[PDB]
Amino acid sequence: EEEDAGLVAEAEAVAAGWMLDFLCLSLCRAFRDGRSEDFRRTRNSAEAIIHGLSSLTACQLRTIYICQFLTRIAAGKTLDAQFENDERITPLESALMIWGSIEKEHDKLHEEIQNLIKIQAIAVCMENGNFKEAEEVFERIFGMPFKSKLLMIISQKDTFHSFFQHFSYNHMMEKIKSYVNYVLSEKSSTFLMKAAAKVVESKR
Amino acid sequence: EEEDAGLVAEAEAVAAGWMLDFLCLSLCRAFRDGRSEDFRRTRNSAEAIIHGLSSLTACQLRTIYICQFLTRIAAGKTLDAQFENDERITPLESALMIWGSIEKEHDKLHEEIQNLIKIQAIAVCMENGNFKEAEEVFERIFGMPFKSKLLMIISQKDTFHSFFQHFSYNHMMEKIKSYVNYVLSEKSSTFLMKAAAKVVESKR
Ligand SMILES: COCC(=O)Nc1c(C)cc(C)cc1C
Ligand SMILES: COCC(=O)Nc1c(C)cc(C)cc1C
Ligand SMILES: [Ca+2]
Ligand SMILES: [Ca+2]
């Protein structure tokens, strides 16, 4: 009876791991395609499945971080959303923290996405007339040429500055979609998606 | 591109169907075992997965009704919970509506569970001192010997009546657990649980 219950709990953990990978793939695809409602509904399913998982492998933790990162990026302009216990941290600042924690290569694309999130974390505050909040985000992030140009823009209250058009919110999303395309290629061969694709193809 | 997107959406629907069956099995098992927190977390996952499913087969609708029925039964004493658009309907009355909609055999066990939910829908109101609400639940449900004994109990305000001890909340739960054991046997061979069990056994 206890041995049966134990084997059942272990099978539930295996199935939850398969569901996590499938939901991550689905969330990546909705983000890449710009399918906002599908992204919201998939995010809800991913959060619930994660609360039913206890011990995680390093691979499963990386998968959860990717889901959390995309969720904060999708909420990047929602300055009312609180993703951290410290209520001062904005959504893009929370995405930056996760981006620096993921066990992944720090290639040129990694640093380009990092620097675009830093610029946009300030830009989104400026565009909402939150000038003092922009200076506070700047202080939490930045602690030289890059840094001093941003402080000058904040002090002038230059919301529609040409600098934010060169390193725009759209450019940040496009670079992040390039990374998401690599995660999609990597996770497309996971168990639940492979098995479902084989079923669909067998009916063609 | 559109054909690829279509094949991907069809594979997501297949995987969601597999996840629905697995979560139903998991919810049944937590209900049978009395694992309250596991039941709550599994219910959350089942609700989210159901919102991402559109067209349902008759089998998938029956699976969703079983999940909804157990959720209302687990909330049977939570008179503040609103499961229907009509706010007057209590949780056990909502479970009774689903029990009468499921495409299942109307064997002796079916009618015994039906009559136990009817008695307890009134009993739970009486035990909370909600005497007028007990009469209103009685009117919605009952429209002769069974019916007249219940109306007499409501009018006397006989909360701890011996009748409610003979056909008790515990007796209703035990009969429902007998039914849940049949659903567990039927769904134990579904895809995701079979595959996860095979993985666990291969590591023994
Ligand atoms: C607020 O911190 C917890 C958190 O980020 N939760 C969360 C997880 C785990 C997964 C997804 C897909 C989305 C969210 C919001
Ligand atoms: C309130 O009506 C909708 C409803 O019952 N939703 C629901 C579903 C679909 C599945 C589960 C397991 C639980 C609930 C509460
Ligand atoms: Ca805010
Ligand atoms: Ca109420």
mmCIF file with all atom_site columns, all heavy atoms in Angstrom, chain A residues 8 11-12 15 18 22 26 29 45 48 192-193 196 200, chain B residues 8 11-12 15 18 22 26 29 45 48 192-193 196 200:
data_model
loop_
_atom_site.group_PDB
_atom_site.id
_atom_site.type_symbol
_atom_site.label_atom_id
_atom_site.label_alt_id
_atom_site.label_comp_id
_atom_site.label_asym_id
_atom_site.label_entity_id
_atom_site.label_seq_id
_atom_site.pdbx_PDB_ins_code
_atom_site.Cartn_x
_atom_site.Cartn_y
_atom_site.Cartn_z
_atom_site.occupancy
_atom_site.B_iso_or_equiv
_atom_site.pdbx_formal_charge
_atom_site.auth_seq_id
_atom_site.auth_comp_id
_atom_site.auth_asym_id
_atom_site.auth_atom_id
_atom_site.pdbx_PDB_model_num
ATOM 1   N N   . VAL A 1 8   ? 3.233  5.513  -7.401  1.00 0.00 ? 8   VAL A N   1
ATOM 2   C CA  . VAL A 1 8   ? 2.269  6.429  -8.000  1.00 0.00 ? 8   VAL A CA  1
ATOM 3   C C   . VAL A 1 8   ? 2.782  7.862  -7.920  1.00 0.00 ? 8   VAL A C   1
ATOM 4   O O   . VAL A 1 8   ? 2.762  8.569  -8.926  1.00 0.00 ? 8   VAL A O   1
ATOM 5   C CB  . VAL A 1 8   ? 0.852  6.287  -7.386  1.00 0.00 ? 8   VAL A CB  1
ATOM 6   C CG1 . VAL A 1 8   ? -0.061 7.415  -7.865  1.00 0.00 ? 8   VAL A CG1 1
ATOM 7   C CG2 . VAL A 1 8   ? 0.246  4.930  -7.740  1.00 0.00 ? 8   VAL A CG2 1
ATOM 8   N N   . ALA A 1 11  ? 5.499  8.374  -10.456 1.00 0.00 ? 11  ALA A N   1
ATOM 9   C CA  . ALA A 1 11  ? 4.958  8.488  -11.819 1.00 0.00 ? 11  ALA A CA  1
ATOM 10  C C   . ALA A 1 11  ? 4.336  9.871  -12.031 1.00 0.00 ? 11  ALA A C   1
ATOM 11  O O   . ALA A 1 11  ? 4.514  10.453 -13.096 1.00 0.00 ? 11  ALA A O   1
ATOM 12  C CB  . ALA A 1 11  ? 3.926  7.406  -12.074 1.00 0.00 ? 11  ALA A CB  1
ATOM 13  N N   . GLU A 1 12  ? 3.638  10.417 -11.013 1.00 0.00 ? 12  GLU A N   1
ATOM 14  C CA  . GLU A 1 12  ? 3.090  11.781 -11.124 1.00 0.00 ? 12  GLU A CA  1
ATOM 15  C C   . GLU A 1 12  ? 4.203  12.805 -11.329 1.00 0.00 ? 12  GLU A C   1
ATOM 16  O O   . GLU A 1 12  ? 4.015  13.726 -12.101 1.00 0.00 ? 12  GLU A O   1
ATOM 17  C CB  . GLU A 1 12  ? 2.227  12.138 -9.895  1.00 0.00 ? 12  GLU A CB  1
ATOM 18  C CG  . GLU A 1 12  ? 0.957  11.313 -9.851  1.00 0.00 ? 12  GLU A CG  1
ATOM 19  C CD  . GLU A 1 12  ? -0.170 11.892 -9.023  1.00 0.00 ? 12  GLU A CD  1
ATOM 20  O OE1 . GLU A 1 12  ? -0.237 13.137 -8.893  1.00 0.00 ? 12  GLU A OE1 1
ATOM 21  O OE2 . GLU A 1 12  ? -1.022 11.107 -8.548  1.00 0.00 ? 12  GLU A OE2 1
ATOM 22  N N   . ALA A 1 15  ? 5.384  12.563 -14.988 1.00 0.00 ? 15  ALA A N   1
ATOM 23  C CA  . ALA A 1 15  ? 4.397  13.174 -15.890 1.00 0.00 ? 15  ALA A CA  1
ATOM 24  C C   . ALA A 1 15  ? 4.428  14.684 -15.754 1.00 0.00 ? 15  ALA A C   1
ATOM 25  O O   . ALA A 1 15  ? 4.368  15.374 -16.758 1.00 0.00 ? 15  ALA A O   1
ATOM 26  C CB  . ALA A 1 15  ? 3.010  12.646 -15.562 1.00 0.00 ? 15  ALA A CB  1
ATOM 27  N N   . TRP A 1 18  ? 7.207  16.079 -17.799 1.00 0.00 ? 18  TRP A N   1
ATOM 28  C CA  . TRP A 1 18  ? 6.865  16.081 -19.227 1.00 0.00 ? 18  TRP A CA  1
ATOM 29  C C   . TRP A 1 18  ? 5.922  17.257 -19.546 1.00 0.00 ? 18  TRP A C   1
ATOM 30  O O   . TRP A 1 18  ? 6.057  17.910 -20.590 1.00 0.00 ? 18  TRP A O   1
ATOM 31  C CB  . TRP A 1 18  ? 6.192  14.747 -19.630 1.00 0.00 ? 18  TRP A CB  1
ATOM 32  C CG  . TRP A 1 18  ? 7.140  13.575 -19.702 1.00 0.00 ? 18  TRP A CG  1
ATOM 33  C CD1 . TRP A 1 18  ? 8.476  13.602 -19.991 1.00 0.00 ? 18  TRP A CD1 1
ATOM 34  C CD2 . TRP A 1 18  ? 6.791  12.194 -19.535 1.00 0.00 ? 18  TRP A CD2 1
ATOM 35  N NE1 . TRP A 1 18  ? 8.981  12.307 -20.016 1.00 0.00 ? 18  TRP A NE1 1
ATOM 36  C CE2 . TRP A 1 18  ? 7.961  11.430 -19.751 1.00 0.00 ? 18  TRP A CE2 1
ATOM 37  C CE3 . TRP A 1 18  ? 5.581  11.524 -19.308 1.00 0.00 ? 18  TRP A CE3 1
ATOM 38  C CZ2 . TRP A 1 18  ? 7.957  10.030 -19.690 1.00 0.00 ? 18  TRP A CZ2 1
ATOM 39  C CZ3 . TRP A 1 18  ? 5.581  10.143 -19.254 1.00 0.00 ? 18  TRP A CZ3 1
ATOM 40  C CH2 . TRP A 1 18  ? 6.758  9.415  -19.438 1.00 0.00 ? 18  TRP A CH2 1
ATOM 41  N N   . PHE A 1 22  ? 6.486  20.559 -22.154 1.00 0.00 ? 22  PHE A N   1
ATOM 42  C CA  . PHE A 1 22  ? 5.504  20.836 -23.208 1.00 0.00 ? 22  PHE A CA  1
ATOM 43  C C   . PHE A 1 22  ? 4.953  22.279 -23.059 1.00 0.00 ? 22  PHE A C   1
ATOM 44  O O   . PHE A 1 22  ? 4.819  23.011 -24.056 1.00 0.00 ? 22  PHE A O   1
ATOM 45  C CB  . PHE A 1 22  ? 4.359  19.790 -23.119 1.00 0.00 ? 22  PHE A CB  1
ATOM 46  C CG  . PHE A 1 22  ? 3.255  20.143 -24.069 1.00 0.00 ? 22  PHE A CG  1
ATOM 47  C CD1 . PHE A 1 22  ? 3.383  19.894 -25.414 1.00 0.00 ? 22  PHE A CD1 1
ATOM 48  C CD2 . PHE A 1 22  ? 2.129  20.822 -23.627 1.00 0.00 ? 22  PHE A CD2 1
ATOM 49  C CE1 . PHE A 1 22  ? 2.383  20.281 -26.305 1.00 0.00 ? 22  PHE A CE1 1
ATOM 50  C CE2 . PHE A 1 22  ? 1.150  21.225 -24.527 1.00 0.00 ? 22  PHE A CE2 1
ATOM 51  C CZ  . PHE A 1 22  ? 1.313  20.985 -25.861 1.00 0.00 ? 22  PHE A CZ  1
ATOM 52  N N   . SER A 1 26  ? 5.123  25.500 -25.638 1.00 0.00 ? 26  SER A N   1
ATOM 53  C CA  . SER A 1 26  ? 3.905  26.159 -26.055 1.00 0.00 ? 26  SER A CA  1
ATOM 54  C C   . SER A 1 26  ? 3.953  27.666 -25.747 1.00 0.00 ? 26  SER A C   1
ATOM 55  O O   . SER A 1 26  ? 3.478  28.482 -26.559 1.00 0.00 ? 26  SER A O   1
ATOM 56  C CB  . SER A 1 26  ? 2.728  25.512 -25.331 1.00 0.00 ? 26  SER A CB  1
ATOM 57  O OG  . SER A 1 26  ? 1.518  26.076 -25.792 1.00 0.00 ? 26  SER A OG  1
ATOM 58  N N   . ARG A 1 29  ? 6.384  29.393 -28.165 1.00 0.00 ? 29  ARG A N   1
ATOM 59  C CA  . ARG A 1 29  ? 5.751  29.546 -29.465 1.00 0.00 ? 29  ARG A CA  1
ATOM 60  C C   . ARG A 1 29  ? 4.737  30.681 -29.475 1.00 0.00 ? 29  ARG A C   1
ATOM 61  O O   . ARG A 1 29  ? 4.710  31.446 -30.430 1.00 0.00 ? 29  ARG A O   1
ATOM 62  C CB  . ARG A 1 29  ? 5.117  28.215 -29.886 1.00 0.00 ? 29  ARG A CB  1
ATOM 63  C CG  . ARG A 1 29  ? 5.351  27.942 -31.346 1.00 0.00 ? 29  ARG A CG  1
ATOM 64  C CD  . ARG A 1 29  ? 4.541  26.765 -31.824 1.00 0.00 ? 29  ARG A CD  1
ATOM 65  N NE  . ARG A 1 29  ? 4.968  25.521 -31.185 1.00 0.00 ? 29  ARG A NE  1
ATOM 66  C CZ  . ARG A 1 29  ? 5.912  24.718 -31.661 1.00 0.00 ? 29  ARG A CZ  1
ATOM 67  N NH1 . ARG A 1 29  ? 6.531  25.009 -32.799 1.00 0.00 ? 29  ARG A NH1 1
ATOM 68  N NH2 . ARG A 1 29  ? 6.223  23.600 -31.021 1.00 0.00 ? 29  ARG A NH2 1
ATOM 69  N N   . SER A 1 45  ? -1.463 27.760 -17.043 1.00 0.00 ? 45  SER A N   1
ATOM 70  C CA  . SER A 1 45  ? -1.236 26.317 -16.939 1.00 0.00 ? 45  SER A CA  1
ATOM 71  C C   . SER A 1 45  ? 0.169  25.971 -16.440 1.00 0.00 ? 45  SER A C   1
ATOM 72  O O   . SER A 1 45  ? 0.314  25.086 -15.584 1.00 0.00 ? 45  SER A O   1
ATOM 73  C CB  . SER A 1 45  ? -1.510 25.630 -18.281 1.00 0.00 ? 45  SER A CB  1
ATOM 74  O OG  . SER A 1 45  ? -2.878 25.771 -18.627 1.00 0.00 ? 45  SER A OG  1
ATOM 75  N N   . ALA A 1 48  ? 0.497  26.661 -12.622 1.00 0.00 ? 48  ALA A N   1
ATOM 76  C CA  . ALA A 1 48  ? -0.173 25.640 -11.813 1.00 0.00 ? 48  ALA A CA  1
ATOM 77  C C   . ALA A 1 48  ? 0.662  24.345 -11.774 1.00 0.00 ? 48  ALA A C   1
ATOM 78  O O   . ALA A 1 48  ? 0.791  23.732 -10.713 1.00 0.00 ? 48  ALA A O   1
ATOM 79  C CB  . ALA A 1 48  ? -1.586 25.373 -12.366 1.00 0.00 ? 48  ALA A CB  1
ATOM 80  N N   . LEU A 1 192 ? 6.450  14.721 -24.741 1.00 0.00 ? 192 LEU A N   1
ATOM 81  C CA  . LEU A 1 192 ? 5.017  14.931 -24.981 1.00 0.00 ? 192 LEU A CA  1
ATOM 82  C C   . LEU A 1 192 ? 4.755  15.554 -26.364 1.00 0.00 ? 192 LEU A C   1
ATOM 83  O O   . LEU A 1 192 ? 3.873  15.087 -27.068 1.00 0.00 ? 192 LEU A O   1
ATOM 84  C CB  . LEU A 1 192 ? 4.454  15.768 -23.820 1.00 0.00 ? 192 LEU A CB  1
ATOM 85  C CG  . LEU A 1 192 ? 2.976  15.767 -23.517 1.00 0.00 ? 192 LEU A CG  1
ATOM 86  C CD1 . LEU A 1 192 ? 2.430  14.331 -23.396 1.00 0.00 ? 192 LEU A CD1 1
ATOM 87  C CD2 . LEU A 1 192 ? 2.739  16.473 -22.173 1.00 0.00 ? 192 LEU A CD2 1
ATOM 88  N N   . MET A 1 193 ? 5.585  16.526 -26.797 1.00 0.00 ? 193 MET A N   1
ATOM 89  C CA  . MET A 1 193 ? 5.409  17.118 -28.131 1.00 0.00 ? 193 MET A CA  1
ATOM 90  C C   . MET A 1 193 ? 5.763  16.121 -29.233 1.00 0.00 ? 193 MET A C   1
ATOM 91  O O   . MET A 1 193 ? 5.043  16.070 -30.231 1.00 0.00 ? 193 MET A O   1
ATOM 92  C CB  . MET A 1 193 ? 6.212  18.420 -28.284 1.00 0.00 ? 193 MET A CB  1
ATOM 93  C CG  . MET A 1 193 ? 5.964  19.144 -29.612 1.00 0.00 ? 193 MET A CG  1
ATOM 94  S SD  . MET A 1 193 ? 4.294  19.869 -29.726 1.00 0.00 ? 193 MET A SD  1
ATOM 95  C CE  . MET A 1 193 ? 4.150  19.985 -31.471 1.00 0.00 ? 193 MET A CE  1
ATOM 96  N N   . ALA A 1 196 ? 2.813  13.641 -29.485 1.00 0.00 ? 196 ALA A N   1
ATOM 97  C CA  . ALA A 1 196 ? 1.614  14.281 -30.042 1.00 0.00 ? 196 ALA A CA  1
ATOM 98  C C   . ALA A 1 196 ? 1.800  14.534 -31.542 1.00 0.00 ? 196 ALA A C   1
ATOM 99  O O   . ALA A 1 196 ? 0.880  14.269 -32.336 1.00 0.00 ? 196 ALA A O   1
ATOM 100 C CB  . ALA A 1 196 ? 1.336  15.600 -29.316 1.00 0.00 ? 196 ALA A CB  1
ATOM 101 N N   . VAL A 1 200 ? -0.529 13.177 -34.759 1.00 0.00 ? 200 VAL A N   1
ATOM 102 C CA  . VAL A 1 200 ? -1.080 14.064 -35.792 1.00 0.00 ? 200 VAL A CA  1
ATOM 103 C C   . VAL A 1 200 ? -0.637 13.631 -37.197 1.00 0.00 ? 200 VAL A C   1
ATOM 104 O O   . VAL A 1 200 ? -1.470 13.526 -38.109 1.00 0.00 ? 200 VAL A O   1
ATOM 105 C CB  . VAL A 1 200 ? -0.747 15.542 -35.476 1.00 0.00 ? 200 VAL A CB  1
ATOM 106 C CG1 . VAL A 1 200 ? -1.015 16.456 -36.671 1.00 0.00 ? 200 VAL A CG1 1
ATOM 107 C CG2 . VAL A 1 200 ? -1.539 16.009 -34.262 1.00 0.00 ? 200 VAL A CG2 1
ATOM 108 N N   . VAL B 1 8   ? 0.938  22.106 -35.632 1.00 0.00 ? 8   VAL B N   1
ATOM 109 C CA  . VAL B 1 8   ? 1.369  22.411 -34.271 1.00 0.00 ? 8   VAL B CA  1
ATOM 110 C C   . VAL B 1 8   ? 0.159  22.571 -33.358 1.00 0.00 ? 8   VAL B C   1
ATOM 111 O O   . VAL B 1 8   ? 0.130  21.977 -32.282 1.00 0.00 ? 8   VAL B O   1
ATOM 112 C CB  . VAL B 1 8   ? 2.310  23.641 -34.207 1.00 0.00 ? 8   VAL B CB  1
ATOM 113 C CG1 . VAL B 1 8   ? 2.543  24.069 -32.759 1.00 0.00 ? 8   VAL B CG1 1
ATOM 114 C CG2 . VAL B 1 8   ? 3.642  23.336 -34.889 1.00 0.00 ? 8   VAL B CG2 1
ATOM 115 N N   . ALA B 1 11  ? -1.309 19.204 -32.603 1.00 0.00 ? 11  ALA B N   1
ATOM 116 C CA  . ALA B 1 11  ? -0.493 18.457 -31.633 1.00 0.00 ? 11  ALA B CA  1
ATOM 117 C C   . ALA B 1 11  ? -0.713 19.003 -30.220 1.00 0.00 ? 11  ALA B C   1
ATOM 118 O O   . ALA B 1 11  ? -0.803 18.218 -29.281 1.00 0.00 ? 11  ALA B O   1
ATOM 119 C CB  . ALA B 1 11  ? 0.976  18.538 -32.002 1.00 0.00 ? 11  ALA B CB  1
ATOM 120 N N   . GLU B 1 12  ? -0.837 20.338 -30.066 1.00 0.00 ? 12  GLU B N   1
ATOM 121 C CA  . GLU B 1 12  ? -1.137 20.916 -28.744 1.00 0.00 ? 12  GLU B CA  1
ATOM 122 C C   . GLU B 1 12  ? -2.477 20.412 -28.215 1.00 0.00 ? 12  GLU B C   1
ATOM 123 O O   . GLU B 1 12  ? -2.577 20.151 -27.031 1.00 0.00 ? 12  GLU B O   1
ATOM 124 C CB  . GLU B 1 12  ? -1.104 22.459 -28.788 1.00 0.00 ? 12  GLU B CB  1
ATOM 125 C CG  . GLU B 1 12  ? 0.300  22.976 -29.024 1.00 0.00 ? 12  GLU B CG  1
ATOM 126 C CD  . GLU B 1 12  ? 0.549  24.408 -28.599 1.00 0.00 ? 12  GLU B CD  1
ATOM 127 O OE1 . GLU B 1 12  ? -0.135 24.879 -27.659 1.00 0.00 ? 12  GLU B OE1 1
ATOM 128 O OE2 . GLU B 1 12  ? 1.465  25.045 -29.166 1.00 0.00 ? 12  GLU B OE2 1
ATOM 129 N N   . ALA B 1 15  ? -1.977 16.806 -26.954 1.00 0.00 ? 15  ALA B N   1
ATOM 130 C CA  . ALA B 1 15  ? -1.256 16.802 -25.674 1.00 0.00 ? 15  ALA B CA  1
ATOM 131 C C   . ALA B 1 15  ? -2.161 17.294 -24.561 1.00 0.00 ? 15  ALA B C   1
ATOM 132 O O   . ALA B 1 15  ? -2.152 16.719 -23.486 1.00 0.00 ? 15  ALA B O   1
ATOM 133 C CB  . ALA B 1 15  ? -0.025 17.688 -25.779 1.00 0.00 ? 15  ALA B CB  1
ATOM 134 N N   . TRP B 1 18  ? -4.336 14.514 -23.379 1.00 0.00 ? 18  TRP B N   1
ATOM 135 C CA  . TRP B 1 18  ? -3.585 13.577 -22.535 1.00 0.00 ? 18  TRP B CA  1
ATOM 136 C C   . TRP B 1 18  ? -3.410 14.160 -21.119 1.00 0.00 ? 18  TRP B C   1
ATOM 137 O O   . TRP B 1 18  ? -3.514 13.435 -20.120 1.00 0.00 ? 18  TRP B O   1
ATOM 138 C CB  . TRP B 1 18  ? -2.198 13.276 -23.151 1.00 0.00 ? 18  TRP B CB  1
ATOM 139 C CG  . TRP B 1 18  ? -2.243 12.383 -24.366 1.00 0.00 ? 18  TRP B CG  1
ATOM 140 C CD1 . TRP B 1 18  ? -3.172 11.422 -24.659 1.00 0.00 ? 18  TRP B CD1 1
ATOM 141 C CD2 . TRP B 1 18  ? -1.272 12.340 -25.420 1.00 0.00 ? 18  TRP B CD2 1
ATOM 142 N NE1 . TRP B 1 18  ? -2.829 10.779 -25.843 1.00 0.00 ? 18  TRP B NE1 1
ATOM 143 C CE2 . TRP B 1 18  ? -1.662 11.319 -26.318 1.00 0.00 ? 18  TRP B CE2 1
ATOM 144 C CE3 . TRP B 1 18  ? -0.062 13.010 -25.648 1.00 0.00 ? 18  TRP B CE3 1
ATOM 145 C CZ2 . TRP B 1 18  ? -0.905 10.996 -27.452 1.00 0.00 ? 18  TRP B CZ2 1
ATOM 146 C CZ3 . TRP B 1 18  ? 0.683  12.685 -26.766 1.00 0.00 ? 18  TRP B CZ3 1
ATOM 147 C CH2 . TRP B 1 18  ? 0.257  11.695 -27.652 1.00 0.00 ? 18  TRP B CH2 1
ATOM 148 N N   . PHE B 1 22  ? -4.765 12.669 -17.383 1.00 0.00 ? 22  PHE B N   1
ATOM 149 C CA  . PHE B 1 22  ? -3.811 12.454 -16.290 1.00 0.00 ? 22  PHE B CA  1
ATOM 150 C C   . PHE B 1 22  ? -4.242 13.261 -15.037 1.00 0.00 ? 22  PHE B C   1
ATOM 151 O O   . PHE B 1 22  ? -4.202 12.743 -13.907 1.00 0.00 ? 22  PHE B O   1
ATOM 152 C CB  . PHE B 1 22  ? -2.394 12.880 -16.766 1.00 0.00 ? 22  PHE B CB  1
ATOM 153 C CG  . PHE B 1 22  ? -1.426 12.834 -15.624 1.00 0.00 ? 22  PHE B CG  1
ATOM 154 C CD1 . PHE B 1 22  ? -0.921 11.636 -15.182 1.00 0.00 ? 22  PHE B CD1 1
ATOM 155 C CD2 . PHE B 1 22  ? -1.099 13.987 -14.924 1.00 0.00 ? 22  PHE B CD2 1
ATOM 156 C CE1 . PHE B 1 22  ? -0.069 11.589 -14.079 1.00 0.00 ? 22  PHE B CE1 1
ATOM 157 C CE2 . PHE B 1 22  ? -0.269 13.926 -13.811 1.00 0.00 ? 22  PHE B CE2 1
ATOM 158 C CZ  . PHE B 1 22  ? 0.200  12.719 -13.380 1.00 0.00 ? 22  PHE B CZ  1
ATOM 159 N N   . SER B 1 26  ? -5.264 11.990 -11.242 1.00 0.00 ? 26  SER B N   1
ATOM 160 C CA  . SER B 1 26  ? -4.562 12.509 -10.091 1.00 0.00 ? 26  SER B CA  1
ATOM 161 C C   . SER B 1 26  ? -5.538 13.128 -9.074  1.00 0.00 ? 26  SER B C   1
ATOM 162 O O   . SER B 1 26  ? -5.349 12.967 -7.854  1.00 0.00 ? 26  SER B O   1
ATOM 163 C CB  . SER B 1 26  ? -3.560 13.560 -10.563 1.00 0.00 ? 26  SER B CB  1
ATOM 164 O OG  . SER B 1 26  ? -2.796 14.015 -9.467  1.00 0.00 ? 26  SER B OG  1
ATOM 165 N N   . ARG B 1 29  ? -7.503 10.334 -7.321  1.00 0.00 ? 29  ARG B N   1
ATOM 166 C CA  . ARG B 1 29  ? -6.659 9.699  -6.321  1.00 0.00 ? 29  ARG B CA  1
ATOM 167 C C   . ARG B 1 29  ? -6.515 10.554 -5.071  1.00 0.00 ? 29  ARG B C   1
ATOM 168 O O   . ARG B 1 29  ? -6.588 10.019 -3.973  1.00 0.00 ? 29  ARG B O   1
ATOM 169 C CB  . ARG B 1 29  ? -5.297 9.363  -6.939  1.00 0.00 ? 29  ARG B CB  1
ATOM 170 C CG  . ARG B 1 29  ? -4.819 8.008  -6.494  1.00 0.00 ? 29  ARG B CG  1
ATOM 171 C CD  . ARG B 1 29  ? -3.389 7.766  -6.900  1.00 0.00 ? 29  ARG B CD  1
ATOM 172 N NE  . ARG B 1 29  ? -3.245 7.703  -8.355  1.00 0.00 ? 29  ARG B NE  1
ATOM 173 C CZ  . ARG B 1 29  ? -3.353 6.590  -9.072  1.00 0.00 ? 29  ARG B CZ  1
ATOM 174 N NH1 . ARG B 1 29  ? -3.591 5.427  -8.478  1.00 0.00 ? 29  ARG B NH1 1
ATOM 175 N NH2 . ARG B 1 29  ? -3.191 6.626  -10.387 1.00 0.00 ? 29  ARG B NH2 1
ATOM 176 N N   . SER B 1 45  ? -4.485 23.019 -11.554 1.00 0.00 ? 45  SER B N   1
ATOM 177 C CA  . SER B 1 45  ? -3.894 22.591 -12.825 1.00 0.00 ? 45  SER B CA  1
ATOM 178 C C   . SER B 1 45  ? -4.940 22.115 -13.836 1.00 0.00 ? 45  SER B C   1
ATOM 179 O O   . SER B 1 45  ? -4.855 22.475 -15.019 1.00 0.00 ? 45  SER B O   1
ATOM 180 C CB  . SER B 1 45  ? -2.844 21.501 -12.590 1.00 0.00 ? 45  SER B CB  1
ATOM 181 O OG  . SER B 1 45  ? -1.764 22.022 -11.831 1.00 0.00 ? 45  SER B OG  1
ATOM 182 N N   . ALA B 1 48  ? -6.887 25.131 -15.344 1.00 0.00 ? 48  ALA B N   1
ATOM 183 C CA  . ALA B 1 48  ? -6.093 25.868 -16.329 1.00 0.00 ? 48  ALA B CA  1
ATOM 184 C C   . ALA B 1 48  ? -6.023 25.092 -17.660 1.00 0.00 ? 48  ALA B C   1
ATOM 185 O O   . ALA B 1 48  ? -6.148 25.696 -18.727 1.00 0.00 ? 48  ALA B O   1
ATOM 186 C CB  . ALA B 1 48  ? -4.683 26.142 -15.772 1.00 0.00 ? 48  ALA B CB  1
ATOM 187 N N   . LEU B 1 192 ? -0.616 9.092  -20.664 1.00 0.00 ? 192 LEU B N   1
ATOM 188 C CA  . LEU B 1 192 ? 0.437  9.752  -19.882 1.00 0.00 ? 192 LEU B CA  1
ATOM 189 C C   . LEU B 1 192 ? 0.768  8.971  -18.598 1.00 0.00 ? 192 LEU B C   1
ATOM 190 O O   . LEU B 1 192 ? 1.938  8.779  -18.304 1.00 0.00 ? 192 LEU B O   1
ATOM 191 C CB  . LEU B 1 192 ? 0.000  11.203 -19.617 1.00 0.00 ? 192 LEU B CB  1
ATOM 192 C CG  . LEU B 1 192 ? 1.017  12.259 -19.262 1.00 0.00 ? 192 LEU B CG  1
ATOM 193 C CD1 . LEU B 1 192 ? 2.184  12.274 -20.268 1.00 0.00 ? 192 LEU B CD1 1
ATOM 194 C CD2 . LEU B 1 192 ? 0.343  13.639 -19.306 1.00 0.00 ? 192 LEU B CD2 1
ATOM 195 N N   . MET B 1 193 ? -0.250 8.429  -17.896 1.00 0.00 ? 193 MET B N   1
ATOM 196 C CA  . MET B 1 193 ? 0.016  7.631  -16.691 1.00 0.00 ? 193 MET B CA  1
ATOM 197 C C   . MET B 1 193 ? 0.679  6.300  -17.040 1.00 0.00 ? 193 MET B C   1
ATOM 198 O O   . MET B 1 193 ? 1.597  5.897  -16.325 1.00 0.00 ? 193 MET B O   1
ATOM 199 C CB  . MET B 1 193 ? -1.261 7.412  -15.862 1.00 0.00 ? 193 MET B CB  1
ATOM 200 C CG  . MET B 1 193 ? -1.015 6.695  -14.531 1.00 0.00 ? 193 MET B CG  1
ATOM 201 S SD  . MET B 1 193 ? -0.110 7.721  -13.325 1.00 0.00 ? 193 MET B SD  1
ATOM 202 C CE  . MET B 1 193 ? 0.537  6.455  -12.297 1.00 0.00 ? 193 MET B CE  1
ATOM 203 N N   . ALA B 1 196 ? 4.375  7.072  -17.852 1.00 0.00 ? 196 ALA B N   1
ATOM 204 C CA  . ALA B 1 196 ? 5.123  7.467  -16.650 1.00 0.00 ? 196 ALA B CA  1
ATOM 205 C C   . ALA B 1 196 ? 5.358  6.247  -15.752 1.00 0.00 ? 196 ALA B C   1
ATOM 206 O O   . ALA B 1 196 ? 6.477  6.059  -15.241 1.00 0.00 ? 196 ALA B O   1
ATOM 207 C CB  . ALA B 1 196 ? 4.353  8.545  -15.882 1.00 0.00 ? 196 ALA B CB  1
ATOM 208 N N   . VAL B 1 200 ? 8.984  4.635  -14.386 1.00 0.00 ? 200 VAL B N   1
ATOM 209 C CA  . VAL B 1 200 ? 9.268  4.361  -12.972 1.00 0.00 ? 200 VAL B CA  1
ATOM 210 C C   . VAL B 1 200 ? 9.656  2.892  -12.753 1.00 0.00 ? 200 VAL B C   1
ATOM 211 O O   . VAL B 1 200 ? 10.660 2.605  -12.084 1.00 0.00 ? 200 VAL B O   1
ATOM 212 C CB  . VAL B 1 200 ? 8.089  4.820  -12.081 1.00 0.00 ? 200 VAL B CB  1
ATOM 213 C CG1 . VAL B 1 200 ? 8.198  4.268  -10.659 1.00 0.00 ? 200 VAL B CG1 1
ATOM 214 C CG2 . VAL B 1 200 ? 8.012  6.340  -12.055 1.00 0.00 ? 200 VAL B CG2 1
#
